[PDB]
Amino acid sequence: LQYGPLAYILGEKATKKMTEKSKLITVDGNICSGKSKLAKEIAEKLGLKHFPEAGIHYVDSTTGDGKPLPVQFSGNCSLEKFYDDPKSNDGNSYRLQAWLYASRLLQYADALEHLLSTGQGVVLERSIYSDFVFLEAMYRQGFIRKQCVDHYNQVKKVTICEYLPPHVVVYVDVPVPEVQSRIQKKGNPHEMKITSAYLQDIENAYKGTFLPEMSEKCEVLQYSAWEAQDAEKVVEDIEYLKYDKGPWLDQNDRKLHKLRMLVQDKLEVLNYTSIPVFLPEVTVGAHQSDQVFQEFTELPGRKYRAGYNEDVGDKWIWLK
Amino acid sequence: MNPIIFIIILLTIMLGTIIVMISSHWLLVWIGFEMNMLAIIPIMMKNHNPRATEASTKYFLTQSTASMLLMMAVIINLMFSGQWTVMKLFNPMASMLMTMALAMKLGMAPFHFWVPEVTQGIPLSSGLILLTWQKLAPMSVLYQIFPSINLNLILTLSVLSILIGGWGGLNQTQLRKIMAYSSIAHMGWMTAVLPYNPTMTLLNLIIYIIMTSTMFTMFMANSTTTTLSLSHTWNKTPIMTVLILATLLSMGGLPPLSGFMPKWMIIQEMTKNNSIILPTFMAITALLNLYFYMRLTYSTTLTMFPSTNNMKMKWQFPLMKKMTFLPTMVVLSTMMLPLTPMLSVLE
Amino acid sequence: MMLYIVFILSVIFVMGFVGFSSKPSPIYGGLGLIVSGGVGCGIVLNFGGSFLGLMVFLIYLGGMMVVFGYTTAMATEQYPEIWLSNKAVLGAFVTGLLMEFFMVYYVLKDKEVEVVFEFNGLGDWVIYDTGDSGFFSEEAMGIAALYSYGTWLVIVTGWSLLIGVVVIMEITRG
Amino acid sequence: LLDLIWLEAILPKTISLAQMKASTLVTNQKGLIKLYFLSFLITILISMILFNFHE
Amino acid sequence: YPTKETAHWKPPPWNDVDPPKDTLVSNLTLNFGPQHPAAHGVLRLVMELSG
Amino acid sequence: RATFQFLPDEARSLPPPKLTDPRLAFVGFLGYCSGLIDNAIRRRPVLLAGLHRQLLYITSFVFVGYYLLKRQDYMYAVRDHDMFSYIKSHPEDFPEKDKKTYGEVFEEFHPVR
Amino acid sequence: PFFDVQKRLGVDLDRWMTIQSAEQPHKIPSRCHAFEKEWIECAHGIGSIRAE
Amino acid sequence: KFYIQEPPHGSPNWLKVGLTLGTSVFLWIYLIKQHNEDVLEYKRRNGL
Amino acid sequence: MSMVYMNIMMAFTVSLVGLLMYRSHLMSSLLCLEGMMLSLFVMAALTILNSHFTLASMMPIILLVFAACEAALGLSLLVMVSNTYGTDYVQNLNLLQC
Amino acid sequence: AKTVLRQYWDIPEGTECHRKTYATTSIGGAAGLVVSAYSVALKTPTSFLEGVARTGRYTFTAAAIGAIFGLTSCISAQVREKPDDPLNYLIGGCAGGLILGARTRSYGIGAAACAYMGLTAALVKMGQLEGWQVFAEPKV
Numbered sequence A: 001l002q003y004g005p006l007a008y009i010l011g012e013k014a015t016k017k018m019t020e021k022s023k024l025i026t027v028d029g030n031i032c033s034g035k036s037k038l039a040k041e042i043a044e045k046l047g048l049k050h051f052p053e054a055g056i057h058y059v060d061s062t063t064g065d066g067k068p069l070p071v072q073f074s075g076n077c078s079l080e081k082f083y084d085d086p087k088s089n090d091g092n093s094y095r096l097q098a099w100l101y102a103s104r105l106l107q108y109a110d111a112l113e114h115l116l117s118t119g120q121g122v123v124l125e126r127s128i129y130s131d132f133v134f135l136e137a138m139y140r141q142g143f144i145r146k147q148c149v150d151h152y153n154q155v156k157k158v159t160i161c162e163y164l165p166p167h168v169v170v171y172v173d174v175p176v177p178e179v180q181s182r183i184q185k186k187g188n189p190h191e192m193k194i195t196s197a198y199l200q201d202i203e204n205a206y207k208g209t210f211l212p213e214m215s216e217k218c219e220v221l222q223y224s225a226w227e228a229q230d231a232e233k234v235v236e237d238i239e240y241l242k243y244d245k246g247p248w249l250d251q252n253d254r255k256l257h258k259l260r261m262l263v264q265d266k267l268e269v270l271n272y273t274s275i276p277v278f279l280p281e282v283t284v285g286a287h288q289s290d291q292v293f294q295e296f297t298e299l300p301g302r303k304y305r306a307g308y309n310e311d312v313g314d315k316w317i318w319l320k
Numbered sequence B: 001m002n003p004i005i006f007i008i009i010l011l012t013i014m015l016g017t018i019i020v021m022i023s024s025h026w027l028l029v030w031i032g033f034e035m036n037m038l039a040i041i042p043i044m045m046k047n048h049n050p051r052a053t054e055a056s057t058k059y060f061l062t063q064s065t066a067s068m069l070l071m072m073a074v075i076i077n078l079m080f081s082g083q084w085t086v087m088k089l090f091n092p093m094a095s096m097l098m099t100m101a102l103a104m105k106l107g108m109a110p111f112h113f114w115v116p117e118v119t120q121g122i123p124l125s126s127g128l129i130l131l132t133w134q135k136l137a138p139m140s141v142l143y144q145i146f147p148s149i150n151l152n153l154i155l156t157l158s159v160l161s162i163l164i165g166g167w168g169g170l171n172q173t174q175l176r177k178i179m180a181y182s183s184i185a186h187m188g189w190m191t192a193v194l195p196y197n198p199t200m201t202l203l204n205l206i207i208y209i210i211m212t213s214t215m216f217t218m219f220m221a222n223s224t225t226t227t228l229s230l231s232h233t234w235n236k237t238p239i240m241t242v243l244i245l246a247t248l249l250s251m252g253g254l255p256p257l258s259g260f261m262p263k264w265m266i267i268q269e270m271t272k273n274n275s276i277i278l279p280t281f282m283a284i285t286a287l288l289n290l291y292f293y294m295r296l297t298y299s300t301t302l303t304m305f306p307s308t309n310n311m312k313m314k315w316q317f318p319l320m321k322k323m324t325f326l327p328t329m330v331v332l333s334t335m336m337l338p339l340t341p342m343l344s345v346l347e
Numbered sequence C: 001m002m003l004y005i006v007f008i009l010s011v012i013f014v015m016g017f018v019g020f021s022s023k024p025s026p027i028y029g030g031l032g033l034i035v036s037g038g039v040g041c042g043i044v045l046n047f048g049g050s051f052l053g054l055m056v057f058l059i060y061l062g063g064m065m066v067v068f069g070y071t072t073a074m075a076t077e078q079y080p081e082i083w084l085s086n087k088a089v090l091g092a093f094v095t096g097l098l099m100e101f102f103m104v105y106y107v108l109k110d111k112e113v114e115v116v117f118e119f120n121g122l123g124d125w126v127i128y129d130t131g132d133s134g135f136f137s138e139e140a141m142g143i144a145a146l147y148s149y150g151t152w153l154v155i156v157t158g159w160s161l162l163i164g165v166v167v168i169m170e171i172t173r174g
Numbered sequence D: 001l002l003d004l005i006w007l008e009a010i011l012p013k014t015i016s017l018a019q020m021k022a023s024t025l026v027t028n029q030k031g032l033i034k035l036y037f038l039s040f041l042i043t044i045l046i047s048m049i050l051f052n053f054h055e
Numbered sequence E: 001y002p003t004k005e006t007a008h009w010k011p012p013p014w015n016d017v018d019p020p021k022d023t024l025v026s027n028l029t030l031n032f033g034p035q036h037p038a039a040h041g042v043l044r045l046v047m048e049l050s051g
Numbered sequence F: 001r002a003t004f005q006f007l008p009d010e011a012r013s014l015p016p017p018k019l020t021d022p023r024l025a026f027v028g029f030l031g032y033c034s035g036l037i038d039n040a041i042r043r044r045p046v047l048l049a050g051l052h053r054q055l056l057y058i059t060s061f062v063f064v065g066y067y068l069l070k071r072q073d074y075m076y077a078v079r080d081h082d083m084f085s086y087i088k089s090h091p092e093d094f095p096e097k098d099k100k101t102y103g104e105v106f107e108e109f110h111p112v113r
Numbered sequence G: 001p002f003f004d005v006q007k008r009l010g011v012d013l014d015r016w017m018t019i020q021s022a023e024q025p026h027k028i029p030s031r032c033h034a035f036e037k038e039w040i041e042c043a044h045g046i047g048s049i050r051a052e
Numbered sequence H: 001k002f003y004i005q006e007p008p009h010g011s012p013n014w015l016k017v018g019l020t021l022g023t024s025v026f027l028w029i030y031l032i033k034q035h036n037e038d039v040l041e042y043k044r045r046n047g048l
Numbered sequence I: 001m002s003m004v005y006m007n008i009m010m011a012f013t014v015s016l017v018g019l020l021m022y023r024s025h026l027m028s029s030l031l032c033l034e035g036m037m038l039s040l041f042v043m044a045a046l047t048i049l050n051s052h053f054t055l056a057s058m059m060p061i062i063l064l065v066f067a068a069c070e071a072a073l074g075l076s077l078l079v080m081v082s083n084t085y086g087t088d089y090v091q092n093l094n095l096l097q098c
Numbered sequence J: 001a002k003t004v005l006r007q008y009w010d011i012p013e014g015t016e017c018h019r020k021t022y023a024t025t026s027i028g029g030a031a032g033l034v035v036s037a038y039s040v041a042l043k044t045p046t047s048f049l050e051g052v053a054r055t056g057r058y059t060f061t062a063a064a065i066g067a068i069f070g071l072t073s074c075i076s077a078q079v080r081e082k083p084d085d086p087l088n089y090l091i092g093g094c095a096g097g098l099i100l101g102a103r104t105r106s107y108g109i110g111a112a113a114c115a116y117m118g119l120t121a122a123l124v125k126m127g128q129l130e131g132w133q134v135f136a137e138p139k140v
């Protein structure tokens, strides 16, 4: 039985599967702050599912055969191109930021669906709740217009209101000069072009907005660079959290059922990420969209609904 | 709302309507309307926002006022006949009050102001019930009292409804308000033919409900409530744009589609009674409905509007909405004309 | 004069309606509705409906007490309006009283009146039944039959009242 | 004079202009409960006083 | 069709939700004492009440 | 005739619609179109996918349609039966006229010049 | 009634209270019982157009 | 290609497939049997 | 008709005009709805009692039952209007003009 | 309206023109008052005076259209000595449409009104002559 009101009535209620270990943990920080490694260790020690940070091709990893699609099917938005030319005339900077917010929104729904349906917690690397720091940094450097910021806020207001914040927010506080050294040692040519003012804006937004906001509704663990190295000590911190605040205490089977019906319906999750607001950065002409849409349907296993593609070995189609 | 509570409330909406349709006693008819009104308000408030609160408040005030007028008519009828049987009324003042009360419940002009606002303020699923199922009870009552209805009053309400419904839809960009003004116009055709052949009223009602359900279901499938959000449908589900086009053409009454059948039969019954001016006026005025149906087809199916980059992320997921009965409804909405003589089943 | 008791009560009945229809503060509108409920009970009692008259008074007294509580919470202002404090309220009040006074004055002058529709004015007693001597209250017998004849009425009213509780809980749970 | 002006003006352009004006009159409302119900009272009154729909 | 009477109209919210008013449901302020049986005659307990 | 009855018993004195009725075939074709639209909106191979589902669309349309046509035919029989019985009962309202030939009836000639 | 399920099913949901000359508790007659009985029997079966 | 997630409709729902074909066969048999009844009854009432 | 009916029919009309001519408080208008039900109860009760329509004696009781359901429903919506805006004024309920 | 309408059609064409203008002016004034009542109720005037100004402006405009029509159509019938001709209502109808353009200050509304008021009035006389029914009584 696919989840629905009938499954709820017969007994599929969230409070049955949810224990004291059913938590949503988000790991945040600046670029090259060690989030990824810390997030992977926390997930493994606490026995939760790990979600690698949602990038450009996150959605491809969840549909089809899970492999990245050509870049025309992500809008041609490029993170490398954002570093080379943050002020591109083709609106790549915001188009990339709008694409990334939608990818995070989708990942958050997937994380919530996993948590509500199995009771196993999850670990994320940044989320819809902290994605705005990049937008604020982009705007203060002049990489995007105030209108792009307005569009981002319109989409956020009508999307982030539907979900619950993470139980635990883990922040790794690495100062900007150290990050600049870390980015420098990493080696990839494009990321070396990040300016310190850009990284300071990410930090200023993280501490000036995200953390004060999250504190009122989540458990926040703020670690320095050295404390963060030993994931065992972070796990010990999480294990003795009281969990005395936030909107999760007010949740009941009735409310989590309504939430589950949303996060399992991805087209409903993404509904407002394509609101008809015509910014040049994100507006696609009808001739371009038509061509790309045709090519997408000609990919292996994408013409039909999953399980009805004979080109990739689906059988019993005449009975399915 | 708990899923079991939602089902019980929906069954109470239907039970109230069914009570009206099986009752031989005016008191039970009035009870049925009250029970129906009681159970629909929580469906309007189900999303709990200031617009739904305003919508439900405006609906309750209008429906509760109409029920008072209805009960007044029943009591006057009791004084002048000493009985409660659901049938022709025995006092012309009782007939005026009951007719005005039923017109209020139907949202016919000039009692129409609530329909565009209430429909806009509630979800698509709730608007579907409001504009289809909720017409059954008031119509079933008119079907029984029409011998005592004042001919000038009912035809005045019908004409004003066709004009105001047609004119009102011209200025709308919101889909729910477009459906609301369409409903006002279609109500006019239903009650225009009522004094002449009530069977044609039922055919128009049945065909209208099918087409209206088809449109609301297609809007729900894509979660579209504005003209512009519906203009992205070509870049997601091309098949749906074609079904929308066919239904909209059908609702406009164009041959050889089903929606032409009620207009065809209503003109026939009116001309048989030497009513020539009125059916000609109604058909020409209905061209306003076709105009703003056609605008939707232009922005939905017959052109390709600009899209957004984030839409590409939608290509990778299938439609998950139930879309119950939609394949059957759209076929019935468009392909029924060769079976028109089947209307005798409604006699 | 006592023979016109039903007419006199009906005049006060209308006066109470003008009281709350002119819409002063709902505190005073509630008072107008309570007066009309009492005299309305008096009117129905004088036609042989003791149970109906007392029941409608009992029901509206409970209703207006709940309205009083909601008024102090949700429908109050710094200066609640009496009938004399607002020009619109006063105009409606006087207009209603004058219309009532004129209908009464003329119907009692001609022992009849024509206010849209023809009303006799001989005293409401003329239409009463002349010959009864049963050992029971006919109104009581009709009301009691709710439980033997009105099974269907019991079901739909019982269900409606249960759904009412369910519905108000939904409506008021934001 | 004829094809691009007067034959347009006297039929399609005039007819469509009237429909637009009528639409704005119908739909330009304040959304105020007080005004809509005040219009109900007027309709009931003229329905009786002028048209005798109650007779 | 724009008109002077509709010039101030805006398209409704995308998700039908209007922002909540910052209207203040102000609390009732009560002087509980000093002259009060429970204030021991000299306590001016200024209380903000909701109901 | 019978109150709230779909097919009154008197309707069995009429022949049933043939299963090869052209109207029934059209109704079945509508069921087929419904099946194809069902596949199309769910992005399944339109012709091939779910033949059992397509079969039930055709069968259910034909099943309901057979009873509608049976009731449609019955109601037109009742209309004819009522109309002729009324003509028998009121001969004076439906007199049989004396028919005149065109050699006797004067019709004006309107030249097309 | 629009749908006469009462007649088909043979269940009396509300037509016991439609007329004042139907059976009453303890056979209490209405004041106009005879007049209602006379009018009801005159008009029975012939339809409103003739009965009017 | 090979899906990263097992499709909901990856394999037939045989409980459904059986019910769907069973209903079609039942309705067709009912319809044919009903039609034969009507033809036989119609001739009997009409002395044919 | 008898003179009582003049005043009861007058009372219903007064309450009906009261309902159709809103002021500001939504509670003032909900009171007019309860008044309309009161006049119907009295007018129904008089006709039924006068004619000795024995079984109809329960009809006014049933009318009050659904009068209360209407009143309870009206107050529930008033609570939600009050919470949203801080007053039960009807001029605040104008969002759905656009 | 039923009584004021009968008065007009009960006094023959060209006979008692002054009486005719009374009836049509009475109809036009009633129509203007109805328009004012709905207008004032649905678009509240800024002040009581402004509501009275709007009413008197609509009611006079509507009465003027009714007056010019009922007079001109009667004068045409009298002068032409043809009381049964629809053309008289066309001339009367167009004149009313012209007055509407005058009270509105807009030759375009004057021209369009003259055409459609004139044709509508002409259609009314034809229907009266031939017995056309607008709200036809049910017969079959």
Ligand SMILES: CCCCCCCCCCCCCCCCCC(=O)OC[C@H](COP(=O)(O)OCCN)OC(=O)CCCCCCCCCCCCCCCCC
Pocket: B237, B238, B239, B241, B242, B243, B245, B246, B249, B256, B257, B301, B302, B330, B334, B335, B336, B337, B338, F040
């Ligand atoms: C039988 C007697 C009764 C007679 C009444 C009339 C009968 C017909 C009733 C019609 C009812 C609606 C059913 C029509 C089925 C439409 C089939 C169709 O649209 O083709 C499918 C295709 C969907 O595209 P897709 O799923 O993505 O496949 C890849 C191609 N892009 O579609 C598309 O890709 C189209 C996308 C571009 C939009 C083109 C729009 C112009 C073509 C419209 C043709 C259909 C018009 C139907 C209206 C009635 C016509 C008389």
Ligand SMILES: CCCCCCCCCCCCCCCCCC(=O)OC[C@H](COP(=O)(O)OCCN)OC(=O)CCCCCCCCCCCCCCCCC
Pocket: B239, F033, F036, F037, F040, F044, F045, F046, F047, F048
């Ligand atoms: C003997 C039959 C004669 C035909 C009579 C047609 C009468 C109108 C019937 C309307 C219903 C049409 C069926 C519903 C549409 C389903 C087809 C579709 O939506 O897409 C086309 C689809 C192929 O595309 P695909 O989605 O990739 O599926 C692969 C399957 N091989 O599927 C296909 O491969 C082809 C399926 C047929 C395509 C139908 C195209 C729509 C035609 C609409 C025009 C209006 C009909 C003509 C008007 C006069 C009506 C007689």
Ligand SMILES: CCCCCCCCCCCCCCCCCC(=O)OC[C@H](COP(=O)(O)OCCN)OC(=O)CCCCCCCCCCCCCCCCC
Pocket: B323, B324, B325, B326, B328, B339, F027, F030, F038, F052, F053, F054, F056, F057, F060, F061, F063, F064, F065, F068, H016, H019, H020, H023
């Ligand atoms: C007026 C003249 C013209 C005549 C018009 C007549 C209109 C009324 C006729 C009925 C129209 C509806 C016919 C629907 C046919 C498609 C049903 C189907 O294929 O379902 C397949 C499967 C469910 O089948 P299942 O319910 O398990 O069968 C056992 C039943 N006890 O599961 C599925 O995957 C189906 C999903 C698609 C269905 C759309 C949603 C509707 C749900 C239908 C549920 C089953 C309907 C069974 C139909 C039997 C009716 C006799």
Ligand SMILES: CCCCCCCCCCCCO[C@@H]1O[C@H](CO)[C@@H](O[C@H]2O[C@H](CO)[C@@H](O)[C@H](O)[C@H]2O)[C@H](O)[C@H]1O
Pocket: C001, C002, C004, C007, C008, C011, C012, C104, C108
């Ligand atoms: C706070 C506001 C209160 C408002 C109350 C409104 C009351 C309404 C007015 C009721 C007055 C009715 O007035 C009533 O009329 C009848 C007229 O025959 C009188 O009845 C009369 O009967 C015969 C007539 O030949 C006379 O001999 C006798 O003197 C006289 O009583 C009553 O004596 C009188 O009381």
Ligand SMILES: CCCCCCCCCCCCO[C@@H]1O[C@H](CO)[C@@H](O[C@H]2O[C@H](CO)[C@@H](O)[C@H](O)[C@H]2O)[C@H](O)[C@H]1O
Pocket: D011, D012, D013, D015, D016
């Ligand atoms: C003669 C017998 C039958 C005649 C029936 C004619 C009815 C009208 C049919 C056409 C309806 C078109 O309705 C509308 O018309 C106007 C012009 O006319 C078009 O509008 C176009 O011209 C107008 C004015 O000339 C411009 O202000 C506008 O910028 C331009 O887009 C609209 O794009 C079209 O939507």
Ligand SMILES: CCCCCCCCCCCCO[C@@H]1O[C@H](CO)[C@@H](O[C@H]2O[C@H](CO)[C@@H](O)[C@H](O)[C@H]2O)[C@H](O)[C@H]1O
Pocket: B170, B284, B287, B288, B291, D015, D016, D017, D019, D020
């Ligand atoms: C004999 C009967 C004929 C029946 C014909 C059927 C009538 C169909 C009526 C369609 C009405 C809508 O048509 C409407 O016309 C006006 C023409 O001013 C167009 O409006 C256009 O011109 C006006 C001014 O010229 C501009 O203010 C406007 O910006 C422009 O869009 C509208 O875009 C169109 O929506």
Ligand SMILES: CCCCCCCCCCCCO[C@@H]1O[C@H](CO)[C@@H](O[C@H]2O[C@H](CO)[C@@H](O)[C@H](O)[C@H]2O)[C@H](O)[C@H]1O
Pocket: J024, J025, J027, J028, J031, J032, J035, J057, J058, J061, J062, J065, J066, J069, J070, J103, J104, J105
């Ligand atoms: C046989 C009887 C014939 C009866 C004829 C009846 C004719 C119909 C009259 C309807 C009422 C008048 O209708 C109304 O006229 C006035 C003209 O002042 C118009 O009003 C408009 O024009 C002028 C100046 O512009 C002003 O009134 C006002 O500023 C403006 O809104 C309204 O837009 C219109 O709604």
Ligand SMILES: CCCCCCCCCCCCO[C@@H]1O[C@H](CO)[C@@H](O[C@H]2O[C@H](CO)[C@@H](O)[C@H](O)[C@H]2O)[C@H](O)[C@H]1O
Pocket: B277, B281, J005, J006, J009, J010, J116, J120, J123, J124, J125, J126, J127, J128, J129, J130, J131, J132, J133, J134
């Ligand atoms: C923009 C266009 C809008 C639609 C326009 C529709 C035009 C319709 C024209 C009116 C139809 C006929 O209108 C009506 O006909 C009937 C006859 O049957 C006349 O009926 C009259 O006949 C007799 C004598 O003949 C009179 O003494 C009597 O007063 C009246 O009954 C009406 O006086 C006339 O008003």
Ligand SMILES: Nc1nc2c(ncn2[C@@H]2O[C@H](COP(=O)(O)OP(=O)(O)OP(=O)(O)O)[C@@H](O)[C@H]2O)c(=O)[nH]1
Pocket: A029, A030, A031, A032, A033, A034, A035, A036, A037, A053, A079, A082, A096, A097, A100, A131, A134, A135, A191
């Ligand atoms: N414009 C933009 N770039 C982003 C966003 N999230 C990540 N990035 C970029 O993606 C790259 C990887 O980000 P990081 O995870 O923080 O860097 P890292 O090397 O992986 O170091 P770790 O924190 O340990 O994971 C960086 O270049 C970021 O600038 C975003 O929301 N907007």
Ligand SMILES: N=C(N)NC(=N)NCCc1ccc(I)c(Cl)c1
Pocket: B196, B197, B198, B199, B344, B347, F074, F075, F076, F078, F079, J140
């Ligand atoms: N015109 C009406 N209001 N009544 C009506 N339908 N008269 C026509 C009579 C009729 C028509 C079809 C059938 I089948 C049957 Cl049995 C009887």
Ligand SMILES: [Mg+2]
Pocket: A035, A036, A053
């Ligand atoms: Mg990383």
